Amino acid sequence: GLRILAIDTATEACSVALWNDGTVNAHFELCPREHTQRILPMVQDILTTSGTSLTDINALAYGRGPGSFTGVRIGIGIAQGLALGAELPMIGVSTLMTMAQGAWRKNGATRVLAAIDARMGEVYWAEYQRDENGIWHGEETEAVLKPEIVHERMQQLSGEWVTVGTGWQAWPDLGKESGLVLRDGEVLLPAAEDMLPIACQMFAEGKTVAVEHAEPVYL
Amino acid sequence: KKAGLRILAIDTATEACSVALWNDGTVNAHFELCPREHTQRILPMVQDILTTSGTSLTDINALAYGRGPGSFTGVRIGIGIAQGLALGAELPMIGVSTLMTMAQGAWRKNGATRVLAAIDARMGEVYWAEYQRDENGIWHGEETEAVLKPEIVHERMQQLSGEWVTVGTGWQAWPDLGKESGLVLRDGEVLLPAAEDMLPIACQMFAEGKTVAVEHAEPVYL
Ligand SMILES: [Gd+3]
Ligand SMILES: [Gd+3]
Ligand SMILES: [Gd+3]
Ligand SMILES: [Gd+3]
Ligand SMILES: [Gd+3]
Ligand SMILES: [Gd+3]
């Protein structure tokens, strides 16, 4: 069948998740001071408990960010090491889309507004809406900008959206006067488990990369 | 097929990104620069070297990695990649000092036996080390590794004696660090660590059983 191993260290969360035909085996935690110090243990626990072998995985999915500059790269490096080891293609998954896919998993959100607390007053933003087939649209809306522009962009949308990401909690004032119906997507950080559905789909479409060109996204 | 010590080393602790394999008496290495942590080039370098030597990751005896000190991000990316490469093949890992690595490079290039290693740690400091190669080719001075201010480096050099060679970006970040040290200093011809130089150190550590499991690969904390 089809097997995909997902890894994410892009934000304050570090997570691993194995998709095995339909069986999802995942772990999720907040990364300690030594950011990725738990990733390998998580990978070892998941592979052993699922009785799966790296030799039998079909592709490595990795969190491409945006998020922490340091965090993201370490996770990617780990994924590359594993992927070169098993001669496997890699799949870069947006942390914003991942959180969007997260909202739809907990409740049923279809129109997500991803906001991650970035650098300065800046913020990683994205407008994601999944179609009927369950595919997320709006990857082009991804960008890094100030809460003022966030306020502007928002007043050019419609209907009701659910919110995800640290951005909203950092500025609960971000929604104020957004001129839109807003709820709580119940997703603060992205999880590898949610990379799986996206990865699966990208693997089916050929949206993969050679280990040598796996890298963070540049907003 | 033909058995023999096989050790794969990679490093991204500094701006440099290098890889090297010790395969049956010979050294096969690549050295490049990876500015702004764009370390993806480590993977093709590893692949090419493996392919050229007819070596498989499963044939490796140990994977040597950069333990630092160096860039906060760089050292961790390197460890991450090394960990990824070691899991499937269950490769033992060997942490090699970035500072010691440069000392080894100085010996390689000019037979230096007493090395003053200094890395621009940024934010006003430097990673320091005093390494002396004994007759058996063993590097002493690891216990001297520390993070300190230039003025403190100056004070410490005055407590030193003899002739030394300098290596690392530390010296260029602080040009007067050598002046009035009371020591006779020559350039060691090493600005940044190179995987090639991790190999000798790694062979010796593997011989002494100084290794760790994948999940225990860690950066040094100074
Ligand atoms: Gd502590
Ligand atoms: Gd560029
Ligand atoms: Gd900077
Ligand atoms: Gd600090
Ligand atoms: Gd000679
Ligand atoms: Gd000079």
> Closest-CA residue in chain A for B40?
A212
CB atoms within 10 A of CB B100: 23
Are B37 and A73 an interchain contact pair (Cβ–Cβ within 8 Å)?
yes
Contact B193, B11 (CB under 8 A): yes
> Least CB-CB distance to A40: which of B38, B39, B214?
B214
Q: Which residues pair with B21 in a beta bridge?
A: B8, B28
What's the N-to-C CA distance of chain B in angstroms?
Answer: 42
- Interface contacts A/B by beta carbons within 8 Å: 91
Structure tokens belonging to residue A159:
């209907």
CATH fold of the domain at A1-94+190-219: Nucleotidyltransferase; domain 5 (3.30.420)
> Least CB-CB distance to A78: which of B46, B81, B88?
B81
> Cα-flanking dihedrals φ and ψ of residue A62, to 5°?
-140, 150
> Cα-flanking dihedrals φ and ψ of residue A58, to 5°?
-95, -20
> Closest-CA residue in chain A for B71?
A70
Residue type, B139: W
CATH number of A95-189: 3.30.420.40
Give me ligand 6 centre to Cα B178, in Å. 9
The SS3 call for residue B50 is: helix
Mutate to test the interface with A, among B30, B43, B67 (most CBs of A within 10 A): B43
DSSP A209: B
At the top level of CATH, which class does the domain B98-192 belong to? alpha beta
Indicate the helix (H) or strand (E) that contains A172.
none
DSSP assignment of A52-93, as one string?
Answer: --GGG--EEEEEEESS-HHHHHHHHHHHHHHHHHTT--EEEE
Helix, strand, coil content of chain A in percent (nearest 5): 35, 30, 35
Give me ligand 6 centre to Cα B11, in Å. 25
Are A75 and B76 an interchain contact pair (Cβ–Cβ within 8 Å)?
no
Are B76 and A54 an interchain contact pair (Cβ–Cβ within 8 Å)?
no
Contacts of B73 in chain A (CB under 8 A): 69-70, 73-74
DSSP assignment of A93-148, as one string?
Answer: EEHHHHHHHHHHHHS--SEEEEEEE-SSS-EEEEEEEE-TTS-EE-GGG-EEE-HH
Q: Which residue has the tokens 């440069």?
A: B102
> Least CB-CB distance to A77: which of B39, B217, B218?
B39
Q: Tell me the nearest-neighbour CA distance from B25 into chain A, angstroms.
A: 24
Mutate to test the interface with B, among A73, A76, A87, A213 (most CBs of B within 10 A): A73
Neighbour-count burial for A89-124, b at 16+ CB within 10 Å, e otherwise: bbbbbbbbbbbbbbbbeeeebbbbbbbbbbeeebbb
Domain with CATH 3.30.420.40 in chain A: 1-94+190-219, 95-189
**A148 exposed, middle or buried (CB, 10 Å; 0-12, 13-18, 19+)?**
exposed
CATH fold of the domain at B1-97+193-222: Nucleotidyltransferase; domain 5 (3.30.420)
DSSP B199: H
